[PDB]
Short mmCIF file of all heavy atoms in Angstrom, two decimals:
data_model
loop_
_atom_site.label_atom_id
_atom_site.label_comp_id
_atom_site.label_asym_id
_atom_site.label_seq_id
_atom_site.Cartn_x
_atom_site.Cartn_y
_atom_site.Cartn_z
N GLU A 1 68.52 2.50 116.85
CA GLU A 1 68.94 1.59 117.89
C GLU A 1 70.25 0.91 117.54
O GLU A 1 70.96 0.45 118.44
CB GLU A 1 67.91 0.45 118.08
CG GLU A 1 66.63 0.86 118.78
CD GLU A 1 65.73 1.76 117.93
OE1 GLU A 1 65.80 1.76 116.67
OE2 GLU A 1 64.97 2.50 118.53
N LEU A 2 70.47 0.67 116.27
CA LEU A 2 71.67 -0.05 115.86
C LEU A 2 72.97 0.73 115.99
O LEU A 2 74.00 0.13 116.25
CB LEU A 2 71.49 -0.48 114.41
CG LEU A 2 71.69 -1.94 114.02
CD1 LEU A 2 70.61 -2.81 114.61
CD2 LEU A 2 71.62 -2.09 112.51
N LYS A 3 72.90 2.02 115.86
CA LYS A 3 74.09 2.88 115.88
C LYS A 3 75.02 2.77 117.07
O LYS A 3 76.19 2.41 116.92
CB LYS A 3 73.68 4.35 115.71
CG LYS A 3 73.57 4.66 114.24
CD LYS A 3 72.61 5.81 114.13
CE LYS A 3 73.24 6.99 113.41
NZ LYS A 3 72.73 7.04 112.05
N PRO A 4 74.51 3.02 118.28
CA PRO A 4 75.31 2.95 119.46
C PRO A 4 75.79 1.54 119.71
O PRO A 4 76.91 1.32 120.16
CB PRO A 4 74.36 3.43 120.54
CG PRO A 4 72.95 3.24 120.01
CD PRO A 4 73.12 3.44 118.52
N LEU A 5 75.02 0.55 119.23
CA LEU A 5 75.37 -0.84 119.43
C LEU A 5 76.53 -1.23 118.54
O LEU A 5 77.50 -1.93 118.95
CB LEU A 5 74.16 -1.67 119.12
CG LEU A 5 74.28 -3.18 119.30
CD1 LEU A 5 74.38 -3.49 120.80
CD2 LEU A 5 73.10 -3.88 118.65
N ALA A 6 76.41 -0.87 117.29
CA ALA A 6 77.48 -1.16 116.35
C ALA A 6 78.78 -0.42 116.71
O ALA A 6 79.87 -1.01 116.68
CB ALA A 6 77.10 -0.64 114.96
N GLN A 7 78.64 0.79 117.27
CA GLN A 7 79.90 1.54 117.60
C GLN A 7 80.64 0.93 118.78
O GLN A 7 81.86 0.68 118.69
CB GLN A 7 79.60 2.96 117.91
CG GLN A 7 80.86 3.69 118.30
CD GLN A 7 80.65 5.21 118.50
OE1 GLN A 7 79.72 5.63 119.15
NE2 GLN A 7 81.54 6.05 117.97
N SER A 8 79.89 0.49 119.80
CA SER A 8 80.56 -0.13 120.94
C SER A 8 81.07 -1.51 120.62
O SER A 8 82.17 -1.87 121.02
CB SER A 8 79.71 -0.18 122.22
OG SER A 8 78.58 -1.02 122.05
N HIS A 9 80.30 -2.31 119.86
CA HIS A 9 80.84 -3.63 119.61
C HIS A 9 81.96 -3.57 118.59
O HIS A 9 82.77 -4.49 118.57
CB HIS A 9 79.73 -4.57 119.13
CG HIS A 9 78.84 -4.85 120.29
ND1 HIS A 9 78.21 -3.90 121.09
CD2 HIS A 9 78.76 -6.06 120.91
CE1 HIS A 9 77.64 -4.48 122.11
NE2 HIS A 9 77.92 -5.74 122.06
N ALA A 10 81.97 -2.61 117.63
CA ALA A 10 83.11 -2.62 116.69
C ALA A 10 84.36 -1.88 117.22
O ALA A 10 85.45 -2.49 117.29
CB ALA A 10 82.72 -1.91 115.40
N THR A 11 84.18 -0.84 118.06
CA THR A 11 85.33 -0.06 118.49
C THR A 11 85.82 -0.35 119.86
O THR A 11 87.03 -0.40 120.10
CB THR A 11 85.01 1.44 118.42
OG1 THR A 11 84.33 1.64 117.17
CG2 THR A 11 86.23 2.36 118.59
N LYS A 12 84.92 -0.58 120.80
CA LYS A 12 85.38 -0.83 122.14
C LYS A 12 85.61 -2.30 122.47
O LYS A 12 86.73 -2.75 122.66
CB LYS A 12 84.34 -0.30 123.08
CG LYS A 12 84.77 -0.38 124.52
CD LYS A 12 83.75 0.45 125.25
CE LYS A 12 84.06 0.52 126.71
NZ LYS A 12 83.33 1.66 127.25
N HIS A 13 84.60 -3.11 122.19
CA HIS A 13 84.69 -4.53 122.52
C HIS A 13 85.40 -5.31 121.47
O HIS A 13 85.79 -6.39 121.84
CB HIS A 13 83.32 -5.14 122.71
CG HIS A 13 82.54 -4.30 123.74
ND1 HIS A 13 82.89 -3.68 124.96
CD2 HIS A 13 81.25 -3.86 123.37
CE1 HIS A 13 81.81 -2.97 125.47
NE2 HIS A 13 80.82 -3.00 124.54
N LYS A 14 85.20 -4.99 120.15
CA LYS A 14 85.88 -5.68 119.04
C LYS A 14 85.31 -7.04 118.90
O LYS A 14 86.02 -8.05 118.86
CB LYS A 14 87.36 -5.85 119.34
CG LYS A 14 88.19 -4.63 118.98
CD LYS A 14 88.01 -3.57 120.04
CE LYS A 14 88.98 -2.43 119.81
NZ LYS A 14 89.22 -1.76 121.07
N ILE A 15 84.09 -7.08 118.40
CA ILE A 15 83.41 -8.33 118.25
C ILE A 15 83.23 -8.54 116.75
O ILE A 15 82.42 -7.84 116.13
CB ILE A 15 82.01 -8.22 118.95
CG1 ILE A 15 82.10 -7.75 120.38
CG2 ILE A 15 81.25 -9.53 118.79
CD1 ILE A 15 83.04 -8.56 121.28
N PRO A 16 83.84 -9.62 116.19
CA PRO A 16 83.74 -9.98 114.78
C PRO A 16 82.32 -10.49 114.41
O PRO A 16 81.57 -10.97 115.25
CB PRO A 16 84.74 -11.08 114.60
CG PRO A 16 85.16 -11.54 115.96
CD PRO A 16 84.84 -10.40 116.92
N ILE A 17 81.86 -10.19 113.20
CA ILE A 17 80.54 -10.66 112.83
C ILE A 17 80.35 -12.12 113.14
O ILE A 17 79.21 -12.56 113.41
CB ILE A 17 80.33 -10.38 111.32
CG1 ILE A 17 80.14 -8.88 111.06
CG2 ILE A 17 79.12 -11.20 110.81
CD1 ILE A 17 78.87 -8.30 111.72
N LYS A 18 81.39 -12.91 113.00
CA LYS A 18 81.33 -14.33 113.28
C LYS A 18 80.69 -14.59 114.65
O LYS A 18 79.95 -15.56 114.85
CB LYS A 18 82.77 -14.88 113.25
CG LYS A 18 82.91 -16.34 113.56
CD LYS A 18 82.34 -17.14 112.40
CE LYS A 18 83.38 -18.21 111.96
NZ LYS A 18 82.70 -19.42 111.52
N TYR A 19 81.18 -13.90 115.68
CA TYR A 19 80.60 -14.09 117.01
C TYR A 19 79.10 -13.77 117.10
O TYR A 19 78.41 -14.20 118.01
CB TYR A 19 81.40 -13.25 118.00
CG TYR A 19 82.80 -13.82 118.26
CD1 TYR A 19 83.33 -14.81 117.45
CD2 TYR A 19 83.53 -13.32 119.30
CE1 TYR A 19 84.63 -15.30 117.70
CE2 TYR A 19 84.80 -13.81 119.57
CZ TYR A 19 85.35 -14.78 118.77
OH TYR A 19 86.65 -15.21 119.03
N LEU A 20 78.63 -12.78 116.31
CA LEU A 20 77.20 -12.44 116.29
C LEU A 20 76.46 -13.58 115.64
O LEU A 20 75.30 -13.86 115.99
CB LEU A 20 76.98 -11.14 115.54
CG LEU A 20 77.68 -9.91 116.12
CD1 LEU A 20 77.35 -8.68 115.30
CD2 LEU A 20 77.18 -9.64 117.50
N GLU A 21 77.12 -14.35 114.77
CA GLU A 21 76.48 -15.52 114.20
C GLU A 21 76.40 -16.61 115.28
O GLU A 21 75.37 -17.25 115.45
CB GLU A 21 77.29 -16.01 113.03
CG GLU A 21 77.03 -15.16 111.81
CD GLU A 21 77.83 -15.62 110.58
OE1 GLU A 21 78.50 -16.64 110.79
OE2 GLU A 21 78.18 -14.75 109.78
N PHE A 22 77.46 -16.75 116.14
CA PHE A 22 77.40 -17.72 117.20
C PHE A 22 76.29 -17.39 118.20
O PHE A 22 75.64 -18.30 118.73
CB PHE A 22 78.69 -17.80 117.99
CG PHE A 22 79.92 -18.20 117.16
CD1 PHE A 22 81.18 -17.92 117.64
CD2 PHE A 22 79.77 -18.95 116.02
CE1 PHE A 22 82.30 -18.39 117.00
CE2 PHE A 22 80.89 -19.45 115.37
CZ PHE A 22 82.16 -19.16 115.87
N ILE A 23 76.13 -16.13 118.65
CA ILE A 23 75.07 -15.90 119.59
C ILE A 23 73.69 -16.09 118.92
O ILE A 23 72.70 -16.46 119.56
CB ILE A 23 75.18 -14.46 120.24
CG1 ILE A 23 74.27 -14.36 121.47
CG2 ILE A 23 74.83 -13.32 119.24
CD1 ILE A 23 74.54 -13.04 122.24
N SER A 24 73.60 -15.85 117.61
CA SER A 24 72.30 -16.03 116.95
C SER A 24 71.87 -17.49 116.99
O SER A 24 70.69 -17.80 117.24
CB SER A 24 72.45 -15.62 115.47
OG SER A 24 72.58 -14.16 115.38
N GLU A 25 72.88 -18.39 116.94
CA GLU A 25 72.68 -19.80 116.99
C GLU A 25 72.23 -20.17 118.38
O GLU A 25 71.45 -21.10 118.57
CB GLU A 25 74.04 -20.41 116.64
CG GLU A 25 74.14 -21.90 116.90
CD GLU A 25 75.59 -22.47 116.74
OE1 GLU A 25 76.58 -21.69 116.57
OE2 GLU A 25 75.75 -23.66 116.97
N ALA A 26 72.83 -19.54 119.40
CA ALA A 26 72.50 -19.82 120.79
C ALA A 26 71.09 -19.33 121.09
O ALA A 26 70.30 -20.02 121.78
CB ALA A 26 73.49 -19.10 121.72
N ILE A 27 70.67 -18.23 120.46
CA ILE A 27 69.29 -17.80 120.73
C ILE A 27 68.32 -18.81 120.16
O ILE A 27 67.31 -19.10 120.75
CB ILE A 27 69.09 -16.41 120.11
CG1 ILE A 27 69.77 -15.34 120.96
CG2 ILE A 27 67.60 -16.12 120.04
CD1 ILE A 27 70.11 -14.09 120.15
N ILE A 28 68.57 -19.25 118.91
CA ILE A 28 67.67 -20.18 118.26
C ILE A 28 67.64 -21.56 118.95
O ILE A 28 66.53 -22.00 119.24
CB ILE A 28 68.07 -20.31 116.77
CG1 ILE A 28 67.59 -19.11 115.98
CG2 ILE A 28 67.48 -21.62 116.19
CD1 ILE A 28 68.31 -19.10 114.62
N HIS A 29 68.72 -21.98 119.63
CA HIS A 29 68.71 -23.23 120.28
C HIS A 29 67.90 -23.12 121.56
O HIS A 29 67.19 -24.07 121.97
CB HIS A 29 70.13 -23.59 120.64
CG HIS A 29 70.44 -24.74 121.64
ND1 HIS A 29 70.73 -26.07 121.21
CD2 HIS A 29 70.22 -24.75 123.03
CE1 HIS A 29 70.62 -26.90 122.26
NE2 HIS A 29 70.23 -26.18 123.27
N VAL A 30 68.08 -22.04 122.29
CA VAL A 30 67.35 -21.90 123.54
C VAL A 30 65.85 -21.70 123.25
O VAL A 30 65.02 -22.29 123.93
CB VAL A 30 67.91 -20.68 124.39
CG1 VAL A 30 67.00 -20.31 125.58
CG2 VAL A 30 69.31 -21.02 124.86
N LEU A 31 65.46 -20.94 122.20
CA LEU A 31 64.02 -20.84 122.03
C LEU A 31 63.49 -22.20 121.61
O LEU A 31 62.33 -22.53 121.83
CB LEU A 31 63.67 -19.82 120.96
CG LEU A 31 64.19 -18.38 121.16
CD1 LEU A 31 63.48 -17.40 120.24
CD2 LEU A 31 64.08 -17.95 122.62
N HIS A 32 64.26 -22.90 120.80
CA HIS A 32 63.78 -24.17 120.41
C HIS A 32 63.53 -25.02 121.67
O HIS A 32 62.63 -25.85 121.66
CB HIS A 32 64.81 -24.81 119.47
CG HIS A 32 64.41 -26.23 118.91
ND1 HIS A 32 63.45 -26.52 117.90
CD2 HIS A 32 64.96 -27.46 119.41
CE1 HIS A 32 63.67 -27.85 117.70
NE2 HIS A 32 64.45 -28.42 118.53
N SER A 33 64.51 -25.09 122.58
CA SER A 33 64.30 -25.93 123.73
C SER A 33 63.11 -25.54 124.60
O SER A 33 62.45 -26.38 125.23
CB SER A 33 65.48 -25.89 124.70
OG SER A 33 66.71 -26.04 124.02
N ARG A 34 63.01 -24.24 124.84
CA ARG A 34 61.98 -23.82 125.78
C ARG A 34 60.59 -23.67 125.23
O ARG A 34 59.68 -23.56 126.02
CB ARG A 34 62.39 -22.49 126.34
CG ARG A 34 63.52 -22.48 127.32
CD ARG A 34 63.19 -21.21 128.10
NE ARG A 34 64.14 -20.96 129.09
CZ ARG A 34 63.90 -20.19 130.14
NH1 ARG A 34 62.66 -19.94 130.61
NH2 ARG A 34 64.96 -20.07 130.92
N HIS A 35 60.49 -23.25 123.96
CA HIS A 35 59.21 -22.96 123.34
C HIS A 35 58.89 -23.80 122.11
O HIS A 35 58.40 -23.26 121.10
CB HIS A 35 59.21 -21.49 122.94
CG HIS A 35 59.61 -20.63 124.13
ND1 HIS A 35 58.66 -20.36 125.09
CD2 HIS A 35 60.83 -19.93 124.40
CE1 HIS A 35 59.37 -19.55 126.00
NE2 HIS A 35 60.57 -19.32 125.66
N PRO A 36 58.90 -25.14 122.18
CA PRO A 36 58.70 -25.96 121.01
C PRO A 36 57.37 -25.71 120.34
O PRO A 36 57.24 -25.65 119.13
CB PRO A 36 58.69 -27.39 121.53
CG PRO A 36 58.74 -27.32 123.05
CD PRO A 36 59.18 -25.89 123.41
N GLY A 37 56.33 -25.42 121.14
CA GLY A 37 55.06 -25.26 120.53
C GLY A 37 54.98 -23.96 119.78
O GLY A 37 54.05 -23.80 118.98
N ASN A 38 55.76 -22.95 120.15
CA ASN A 38 55.66 -21.69 119.44
C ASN A 38 56.89 -21.51 118.59
O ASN A 38 57.21 -20.40 118.15
CB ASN A 38 55.59 -20.55 120.45
CG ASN A 38 54.20 -20.48 121.15
OD1 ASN A 38 53.17 -20.45 120.48
ND2 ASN A 38 54.11 -20.51 122.49
N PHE A 39 57.73 -22.52 118.46
CA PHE A 39 58.91 -22.29 117.66
C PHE A 39 59.10 -23.40 116.60
O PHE A 39 60.00 -24.23 116.79
CB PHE A 39 60.12 -22.19 118.56
CG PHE A 39 61.31 -21.46 117.96
CD1 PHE A 39 61.23 -20.11 117.67
CD2 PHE A 39 62.50 -22.12 117.71
CE1 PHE A 39 62.31 -19.44 117.17
CE2 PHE A 39 63.56 -21.45 117.21
CZ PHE A 39 63.46 -20.10 116.94
N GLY A 40 57.99 -23.69 115.86
CA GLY A 40 58.03 -24.68 114.81
C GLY A 40 58.88 -24.15 113.64
O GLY A 40 59.67 -23.19 113.82
N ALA A 41 59.08 -25.00 112.62
CA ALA A 41 59.90 -24.61 111.49
C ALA A 41 59.57 -23.22 110.98
O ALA A 41 60.46 -22.49 110.71
CB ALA A 41 59.72 -25.58 110.32
N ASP A 42 58.33 -22.85 110.68
CA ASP A 42 58.12 -21.53 110.13
C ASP A 42 58.55 -20.43 111.11
O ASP A 42 59.07 -19.39 110.70
CB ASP A 42 56.67 -21.32 109.84
CG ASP A 42 56.23 -22.12 108.63
OD1 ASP A 42 57.06 -22.63 107.90
OD2 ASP A 42 55.07 -22.56 108.67
N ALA A 43 58.23 -20.56 112.39
CA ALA A 43 58.63 -19.50 113.34
C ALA A 43 60.14 -19.46 113.42
O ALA A 43 60.74 -18.40 113.60
CB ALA A 43 58.03 -19.82 114.72
N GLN A 44 60.81 -20.62 113.35
CA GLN A 44 62.26 -20.61 113.39
C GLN A 44 62.84 -19.94 112.15
O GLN A 44 63.86 -19.22 112.14
CB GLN A 44 62.82 -22.03 113.45
CG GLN A 44 64.33 -22.04 113.55
CD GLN A 44 64.98 -23.38 113.91
OE1 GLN A 44 64.42 -24.24 114.58
NE2 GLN A 44 66.25 -23.54 113.54
#
């Protein structure tokens, strides 16, 4: 699954690892907001 993804984001779109860290942060913030009961410290 990772292959085609890594090829398009590194060669066509040109997305630096840094940005993948930013979206990772955005995912964790939104799950935190929406799912507090299922997203306690261990699940986070």
